[PDB]
Design a protein around this ligand. Structure first.
Ligand SMILES: CNCc1cc(OC)cc2c1CN(c1cccc(-c3nncn3[C@@H](C)CC(F)(F)F)n1)C2=O
Ligand SMILES: CNCc1cc(OC)cc2c1CN(c1cccc(-c3nncn3[C@@H](C)CC(F)(F)F)n1)C2=O
Lengths: 289, 281
């Protein structure tokens, strides 16, 4: 990055506590020594012979995002083989941290979250970005009940490995169209995000994604099989017809048939009136007591 | 390599002339000091890529795949000893000779398909079929060479990254199965047949990054032969079937060996010897 600070951020902030890990490195809650403003500081070990391409891609994605539903980016610091990414602190943490105390979210709470996640996804996809890691752990809630997408770690690793491999591609004139597709897009597109959101809606309703108790390799294997059935909500009478259909269209097995984020935004579940932050303020009141 | 010779090959061979580059490294013509026998020596400066390459070559025992004689390692230089092909690549040839005849193309395609049927039966993929990688020996025989891309894919594959529970099925598909299979070689053979007929692959005058973008863009149309009247209905059909856009519908190498173009009588090395006589004058 060109605007990186060649100094230790602990000269400007005090590390209050560790917030978690993530795809790579760790996140600390930090306080600005002068202003008293809270920030999230993500620290990663940046060795002298390391590639650099992944961290460069991650800060590029964050730096070029200017949307309410994507975590704000403040700046980056490089010091003594440690890279620090300064981002917006989200007071209630992740939806996963929340539902683990609170229990399953209500349909209206899931609906506001889905609409906020879809707004962030429509923004990302419009500027040729893919999150690729949509899940409860990556959806953050600030004190105002606002929703922000975080952890572009998986996205950065893929973007870096795709650029790296595009150098060793060679001439394409003899390449089959499917070979061209894995070289340029990895063999899939941004609609993988729409499916992840559908799994996230179930995760929020049932406290775990479908097949959580099945071997990670076996779940991948079952998806590769013919006659693979997309997951569904367990408790049939707990949820409205709009919620069941939202799950049905987001979890369309074929990406050619799966709706885009913009189309999804006009779905009855996320288009309904009365979806606002107040629904999430009620969730946070339950977190506090 | 477990069978590598830990000495300089220039103890046994005299380096005669550089034949070319290729995916990686350089290829030299070499002559055995005592027997006078000719070999091709592929020299690579210095790990899993080269291991996967020696293994692909060592485990091939088929007439239409360049014969492997062994490997040498001395002072950070790895040397791969293979069959020397006196007439060079089909690209070296057609650049002097001009377009191949339909019968010459048909024989070349049958030979390449025989080599591809063998590779696919061993679960190997060439992934770099083109005129420059199709070699011709002095007898007019056809051999597939440069397993550099295949080795680089193999090594890259050897080293999924997300969390499977939120992963879309097409994402899981590209991780377990590949984003493509061995039928990509069948398409590459269709392009090579056009290249042998026209002296260049389709869209050769278009920027490579642009070419990649037209291909991924749905509604991309498979290429065809430019001079419709010069070629037979069987040759036009062979181009149509090898260049099927859908990997599920594209015929296999053994299926293509029953196609009228490559099944016809009178397909022999003599057709290529007629071509080499044209090169000689
Ligand atoms: C386990 N609870 C997390 C937690 C609990 C909490 O409680 C008050 C507050 C926060 C977090 C995280 N966070 C934050 C803020 C900005 C970016 C990122 C980020 N950028 N890259 C990966 N991350 C996160 C998702 C990784 C990881 F592992 F921390 F979640 N995180 C908060 O402001
Ligand atoms: C440009 N003319 C080449 C040329 C001209 C020639 O004239 C009499 C003879 C030969 C060659 C090549 N060759 C050979 C033989 C075995 C393997 C390999 C090989 N193994 N890995 C990549 N290759 C080749 C395809 C790469 C490259 F760049 F050399 F073509 N090559 C010959 O016997």
């Amino acid at each position: 990055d060109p605007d990186i600070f060649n100094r230790d951020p602990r000269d400007h902030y005090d590390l209050l506590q560790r917030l978690g890990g993530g795809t790579y490195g760790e996140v600390f809650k930090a306080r600005d020594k002068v202003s008293g403003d809270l920030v999230a500081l993500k620290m990663v070990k940046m060795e002298p012979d390391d590639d650099v391409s992944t961290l460069q891609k991650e800060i590029l994605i964050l730096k070029t995002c200017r949307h309410a539903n994507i975590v704000a980016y403040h700046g980056s610091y490089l010091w003594l083989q440690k890279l620090w990414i300064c981002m917006e602190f989200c007071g209630a943490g992740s939806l996963q941290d929340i539902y683990q105390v609170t229990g399953s979210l209500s349909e209206l709470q899931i609906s506001y979250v889905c609409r906020e996640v879809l707004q962030g996804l429509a923004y990302l996809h419009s500027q040729k970005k893919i999150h690729r890691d949509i899940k409860g752990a990556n959806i953050l809630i600030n004190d105002a009940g606002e929703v922000r997408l975080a952890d572009f770690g998986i996205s950065a690793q893929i973007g870096a490995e795709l650029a790296r491999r595009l150098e060793f591609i060679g001439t394409p004139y003899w390449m089959a169209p499917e070979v061209a597709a894995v070289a340029l897009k990895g063999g899939y597109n941004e609609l993988c995000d729409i499916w992840s959101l559908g799994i996230t809606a179930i995760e929020l309703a049932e406290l775990q994604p479908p097949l959580f108790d099945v071997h990670p390799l076996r779940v991948l294997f079952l998806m590769t099989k013919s006659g693979y059935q997309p997951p569904r909500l367990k408790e049939k009478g707990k949820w409205s017809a709009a919620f069941h259909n939202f799950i049905k269209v987001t979890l369309t097995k074929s990406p050619k048939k799966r709706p885009s984020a913009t189309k999804m935004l006009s779905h009855q579940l996320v288009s309904q009136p009365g979806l606002n932050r107040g629904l999430i303020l009620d969730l946070l009141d339950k977190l506090k007591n």
